[PDB]
Design a protein around this ligand. Structure first.
Ligand SMILES: Nc1nc2c(ncn2[C@@H]2O[C@H](COP(=O)(O)OP(=O)(O)OP(=O)(O)O)[C@@H](O)[C@H]2O)c(=O)[nH]1
Ligand SMILES: Nc1nc2c(ncn2[C@@H]2O[C@H](COP(=O)(O)OP(=O)(O)OP(=O)(O)O)[C@@H](O)[C@H]2O)c(=O)[nH]1
Ligand SMILES: Nc1nc2c(ncn2[C@@H]2O[C@H](COP(=O)(O)OP(=O)(O)O)[C@@H](O)[C@H]2O)c(=O)[nH]1
Ligand SMILES: Nc1nc2c(ncn2[C@@H]2O[C@H](COP(=O)(O)OP(=O)(O)O)[C@@H](O)[C@H]2O)c(=O)[nH]1
Ligand SMILES: Nc1nc2c(ncn2[C@@H]2O[C@H](COP(=O)(O)OP(=O)(O)O)[C@@H](O)[C@H]2O)c(=O)[nH]1
Ligand SMILES: Nc1nc2c(ncn2[C@@H]2O[C@H](COP(=O)(O)OP(=O)(O)O)[C@@H](O)[C@H]2O)c(=O)[nH]1
Lengths: 288, 219, 270, 282, 283, 220
């Protein structure tokens, strides 16, 4: 007051963060064949082919791959960690153990690089998983026991946005009933899935509360079919074409509006502040 | 008489296709004995989920030794995955010694035509590799040949009533179109229903003469 | 359009909702125009009539004091800390008068280190002294021994920005001569200044608060000394490069080299 | 008639051959415009301003300045680097020792059995420089005035008088005056001489001390006439008008109105007060 | 910036100057009238009587104003000198007066707590010797005292009552006077003989020593310029006339040009010799 | 006729030789020249201590008188008084007191040209009161004595010069400021001295013979 200045501080944050480079890690959990590789070739508009699984995997394991993407002038390194062999064995009581071990191993990598005397946290590359996409089988009856067990065992370690895979197989009366049943099982079991932000007066009330439609009923594929005058992505059937960019068929738009559009930095900040801080407190209390 | 049991995972809709097949756990509704088997695999561990069906068929033959026999073992293999799970392969390998196995792909309306061709070839490869002796069924010549080629079948079901394109029929309503369960070009519902209708007696006699008779040899 | 390009927008929102913190220390000989420059940098009455500047009030020992300001401008909330050392070099003997400055700076550093290393971390209140403006009297000859010894004993603990102080009391020719002599006296004594990322160091500063009709200037019996001119004084250079260009590069370098160099020395000692 | 009135002419004529000797000392922090003000005060190029360096011992310079038939043998005493060093405690000891050594040399020369015309070496006037802080005197300056004013004539000068708006020059000058009264620093003495005209002159001169003085070596012209002063992008800080500065009164008092008076105070008060302290100790 | 003569003479005028003259000679030679006519102010010097048994010194001090200058003039007349029968010890009291003045100055200068500039200079600066106009040569007393005194004070030989002698006999008396002075080796006070360019001016006067003087207080009316003259029944003799008498030369030399020279020679040349002698004999 | 002698005594430079040569028109020294014997004393007054000197002159006249008793005696003693003084010097008074009873004296003011009208009157009055105060018995001139004793001791000027004045050869001293005259009888009074010397030479001789010799003849 007297006159201006000091409005460029957020701009300086933006420039320094952009120069440093962005990093996002996504954990893809779902039974083999549900569309995880397909949905995340859909989500990032590129071909992340990763071999269509041996259904006779002796043990549940994780395939972690790292790629570089660039849009306009922002550069982001994706660590996509697919659960390979999950839900294929006869014995599934140990299905989620490797995934949790992997998450905690990445947390320990970060925390161990932090405590080193000659640390380089400014330049060191974090490997913690920022968002977890869970694939719900389009059963029509609810959520299976394995889905509940995995979500519960993994709710406090990474953000979960429940996603209905191959959602193009349920009718809309059935889809509404099945969605309401999912959220009923979620609240009754008390699963702390990732909820929309509330604080920001801009979007975090209107879009946040309007998107009370979780879980998202989404579909994915790689073929572009001609609808109207656009090569829109779609899943083809003898009786027609299921479009993915139209709201009335699937909820893929809202899922992307979380992951890549509006709440990605909230996901990273919650990973560093809500989950990493919990693990760090627990570990530092354990070690002394 | 006929004992139609459907076997597989839980939640693939097989109850709906059962109710749609005849336009009208067990049910004796010809005296059609429907056995809507409880969809196994809902539990975390599926080591013992296979057992309940063996003693039921084992006891079934025991009263016969002491026509409730399962003439058709309708097996519904998941549309979601890439092929045969270890659970399905173990169950088919452990069951075909006794009860006449027939494979059918559940929820065919969730699948594309190139993929169903792919999954049929992979299912046949996994049957041949594990020496599974699946039923080869023996105008009658034409339907016999088509059924041999069409193994395994892909079938959709529907219970609710729809005013599609006019006439009131059974089907499914989707924003992309109407799934006509009756229509042969949409799925093999008609192929399955006609095969059972036309080969009911052959199934009874073959069960008595091949599967039941070698069981006497085993017994 | 996976849409990653909206990530800077999200950074914008969170940064503008969480606010920013800055810490500026002003150290030099009294009477050099420190309070006026501080007031004219932020265009506000940080040092008002009731709470004047150091020399207008305080010189007792040679310790250091601080003041807070909340600036809400275009929705950006800036928490500004102005640290003044009131009474430095104004004593007969100035031996080891840098103890107060060093103790304060390492006090803030130790507070931040304790906050970080604690098991249960809250939001880190960044009170570390980010910028340090050192004032040099416009004598025209060279670094006073106190000044050079201060810079030699401070270059490895904080970002020191040497300032020419009173700048209208000093001709441009003598201004350039003093700058060059300052560079030389830094060079042969092995002084590592803050390498500004983007020759201008040290900057010349002149400020005024009495508005003259309507520009901030000083009405001398011969004319008007006006700050904003680029040729006259580099007050615009200091203002821009401190509060509009490198407000956070300074924070980055303080956390990046001046901090772990303090952490490596402390942790190896422990 | 009778000619008793022509005796001043004889004094004038005898003063020509001998030559007057002046010994002026200039004291202040390095960089405070000491050498430059000396250069501008005597209108002569004595420039150690480009001698950017420290010093060791008391710097004394012998010059001969002649004008209008009068010759001044001038000993200018520029102090070594003091006030600049970190340990400024007892930095005035060099100046005090220099003063006492000059006094002792002259007195010892006078006391000998054989005597020539005594070659005076005592310092006559001292000009002290105040840093233009705008708030108050530094403790070093107050201390050195306290330790110095009882030994030689001291005149306080506000160096860099071009840095202050007239209101601030007002406030600073009377702040300095109040401090001078409160520390009881009696500057160049004017106690109560019974003469009237000279007393009112000197009491009107006291009311102006300290002197807002700017030194330089330039010849800048202003639209209309050539002047002496400095340049800033907003004007010409002028040395020769009373409105812009107060150099004129300082030069008048020091050289052209009280310089012989300064010498008389040096010999008849400061030498004599030292002499009674010294000789009684003998 | 070198207008120091103005302030110097301003302080001097605020103070005023001092001067001391001694008049040594036989009684009746005309000292008092000449000193009245030299300062043109009637000092009350009454008609004395010769019966003084020894040489005594009478001192009169006056404050003279002219323009802005105040001058403290101390005349010291020697009475009784050269009249008594025993003329051998007649040169002691003048010596003792000069030495006493120098002793007072030395004691005041060597005093620990001096009295600044307040030293009222009592040192006899000028000394006028009055020589009887006899036409033959110096008396024994005259040569004795002049030789014994030329090394203590600035001595100026002057012929008293010059109206007695004629020009030819005046010049003859002058020539045997200087012959006797050079023969007896006396350094009569010389005006600066080699004073740069004033060398000729103060060497011609040296050659003109001794002077011949005439004094008068009777203002007589000749022309419309009433003068200082003595009116004998045969003619009027002018005091201020270059043709008649050399009083104006003495007045010029003693007052207008060479006061401060006499003071400086008293301080630097004679007083320091006295200082050397006293300090050598002090111990 | 008579063979008058003469004593002339006084301080050097008082114009003794000039006056004796001027008075008789002809040029211890006893020079014989009517037979004049001018006894002029060379050394008296110029000495450092002139204390004894009045004895040798007393000695010589006693020797001259006793030789005559055993006419060359000294009959008149012209004593000279300097014009400079305001009165009589100690030497002058002492010589007159110790010499007046041997040779008969005639007080005479040397160099009358020094004094103005009121000044010559004042000085003459002072000499009168002083001789009447010390009881000095000078030779009393035989009975117009009023303006003699007004003038006594006769103011005199002596000069062997014939300065030209009004076309006449006048006895006079020059100068450079009006000439003086000897014969002028206003206050030069040399005329009085010469006239009454000439016209009472005989009385002078008789009083010397009958008083001073007789006193000496009583002394011896
Ligand atoms: N109808 C329909 N078919 C899909 C959908 N998503 C994937 N598919 C088909 O399923 C096949 C198997 O691919 P994925 O299920 O993505 O492979 P994955 O299960 O993710 O296993 P990974 O490659 O190891 O990640 C694809 O070739 C698609 O043809 C879908 O959303 N709807
Ligand atoms: N002939 C002649 N007479 C002079 C001259 N000057 C003064 N007189 C007279 O000589 C007398 C001597 O004067 P003084 O000077 O008073 O004598 P003194 O020896 O000084 O003794 P005091 O009377 O005590 O002063 C005076 O009465 C004068 O009138 C002169 O130049 N020539
Ligand atoms: N897309 C599709 N949906 C089906 C099919 N069969 C059943 N459903 C849907 O699945 C839901 C429940 O299936 P259900 O028959 O109870 O599964 P089941 O108990 O395992 O037989 C119903 O709302 C049906 O609309 C099918 O073949 N295709
Ligand atoms: N010449 C000059 N004077 C200044 C400048 N800045 C301030 N001043 C004057 O210096 C005075 C004192 O400065 P401020 O306290 O008041 O000085 P500080 O004690 O160093 O903070 C003020 O009254 C200003 O008028 C400058 O840049 N140049
Ligand atoms: N503004 C201003 N500058 C001055 C004044 N006098 C001198 N200066 C400059 O300030 C510098 C002082 O140098 P100098 O006089 O040699 O310092 P010192 O001799 O150590 O006291 C010189 O470069 C001058 O040009 C003045 O009155 N006002
Ligand atoms: N004015 C004046 N001068 C005289 C008189 N008598 C002698 N003089 C001067 O005295 C000089 C020599 O005098 P002198 O006869 O030797 O003196 P004396 O021998 O003692 O009687 C001469 O040159 C004369 O000019 C006199 O009566 N009046």
């Amino acid at each position: 007051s007297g006159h201006v200045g000091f409005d460029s501080l957020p701009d300086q944050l933006v420039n320094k963060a952009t120069n440093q480079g962005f990093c996002f890690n996504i954990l893809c959990i779902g039974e083999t064949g549900l569309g995880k590789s397909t949905l995340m070739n859909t989500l990032f508009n590129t071909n992340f082919e990763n071999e269509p699984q041996h259904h006779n995997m002796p043990g549940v394991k994780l395939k972690a791959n790292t790629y570089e993407l660039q849009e306009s002038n922002v550069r982001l390194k994706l660590t996509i960690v697919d659960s390979v062999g999950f839900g294929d064995q006869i014995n599934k009581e140990e299905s989620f153990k490797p995934v949790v071990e992997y998450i905690n191993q990445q947390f320990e990598n970060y925390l161990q690089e932090e405590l080193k005397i000659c640390r380089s946290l400014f330049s060191y590359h974090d490997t913690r998983i920022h968002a977890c996409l869970y694939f719900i089988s389009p059963t029509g009856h609810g959520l299976k026991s394995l889905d509940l067990k995995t979500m519960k065992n993994l709710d406090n370690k990474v953000n979960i946005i429940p996603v209905i895979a191959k959602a193009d197989i349920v009718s809309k009366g059935e889809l509404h009933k099945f969605k309401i049943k999912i959220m009923n099982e979620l609240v009754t079991n008390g699963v702390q899935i990732y909820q929309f932000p509330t604080d920001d007066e801009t979007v975090a009330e209107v879009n946040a509360s309007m998107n009370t439609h979780l879980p998202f009923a989404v579909v994915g594929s790689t073929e572009e079919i001609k609808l109207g005058n656009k090569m829109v992505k779609a899943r083809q059937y003898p009786w027609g074409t299921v479009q993915v960019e139209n709201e009335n068929h699937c909820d893929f738009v809202k899922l992307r509006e979380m992951l890549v559009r509006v709440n990605m930095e909230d996901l990273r900040e919650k990973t560093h502040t809500k989950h990493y801080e919990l693990y760090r407190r627990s570990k530092l209390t354990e070690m002394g | 008489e006929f004992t139609l049991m459907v076997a597989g995972e839980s939640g693939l809709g097989k109850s709906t296709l059962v109710n749609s097949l005849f336009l009208t756990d067990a049910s004796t509704v010809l005296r059609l004995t429907v056995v809507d088997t409880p969809g196994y695999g809902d539990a975390i561990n599926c080591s013992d989920c296979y057992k309940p069906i063996i003693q039921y068929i084992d006891d079934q033959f025991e009263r016969y030794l002491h026509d409730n026999r399962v003439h058709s073992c309708f097996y519904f293999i998941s549309s979601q995955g890439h092929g045969l799970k270890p659970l399905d392969i173990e169950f088919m390998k452990a069951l075909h010694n006794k009860v006449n196995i027939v494979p059918v792909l559940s929820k065919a309306d969730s699948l594309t035509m190139p993929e169903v061709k792919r999954l049929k070839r992979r299912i046949l490869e996994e049957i041949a590799a594990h020496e599974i002796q699946i039923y080869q069924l023996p105008e009658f010549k034409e339907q016999t040949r088509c059924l041999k080629e069409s193994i395994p079948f892909a079938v959709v079901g529907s219970t609710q009533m729809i005013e599609v394109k006019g006439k009131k029929v059974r089907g499914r309503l989707y924003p992309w179109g109407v799934v006509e369960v009756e229509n042969p070009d949409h799925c093999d519902f008609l192929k399955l229903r006609t095969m059972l209708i036309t080969h009911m007696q052959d199934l009874q006699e073959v069960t008595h003469d091949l599967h039941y008779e070698n069981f006497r040899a085993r017994r | 359009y996976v849409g990653f390009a909206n990530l800077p927008n999200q950074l914008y929102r969170k940064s503008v909702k969480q606010g920013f913190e800055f810490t500026l220390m002003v150290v030099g000989e009294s009477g050099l125009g420190k309070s006026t420059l501080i007031n004219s940098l932020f265009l506000s009455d940080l040092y008002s009539n009731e709470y004047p500047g150091p020399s207008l009030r305080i010189k007792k020992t040679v310790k250091v004091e601080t003041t807070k300001v909340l600036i809400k401008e275009n929705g950006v909330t800036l928490r500004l800390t102005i640290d003044d050392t009131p009474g430095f070099g104004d004593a007969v003997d100035n031996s080891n008068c840098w103890q107060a400055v060093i103790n304060h700076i390492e006090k803030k550093f130790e507070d931040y280190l304790n906050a970080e290393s604690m098991v249960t971390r809250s939001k880190l209140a960044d009170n570390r002294v980010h910028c340090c403006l050192y004032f040099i009297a416009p004598t025209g000859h060279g670094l006073k021994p106190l000044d050079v010894e201060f810079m030699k004993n401070l270059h490895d603990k904080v970002n020191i920005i040497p300032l020419i102080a009173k700048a209208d009391t000093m001709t441009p020719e003598e201004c350039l001569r003093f700058k060059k002599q300052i560079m030389k006296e830094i060079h042969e004594h092995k002084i590592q200044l803050y390498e500004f990322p983007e020759s201008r160091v040290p900057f010349a500063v002149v400020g005024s608060n009495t508005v003259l009709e309507r520009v901030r200037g000083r009405q001398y019996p011969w004319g008007v000394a006006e700050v904003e001119n680029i040729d006259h004084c580099d007050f615009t250079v200091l203002r821009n490069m401190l509060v509009r260009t490198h407000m956070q590069d300074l924070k980055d370098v303080t956390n990046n080299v001046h901090y772990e160099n303090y952490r490596s020395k402390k942790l190896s000692s422990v």
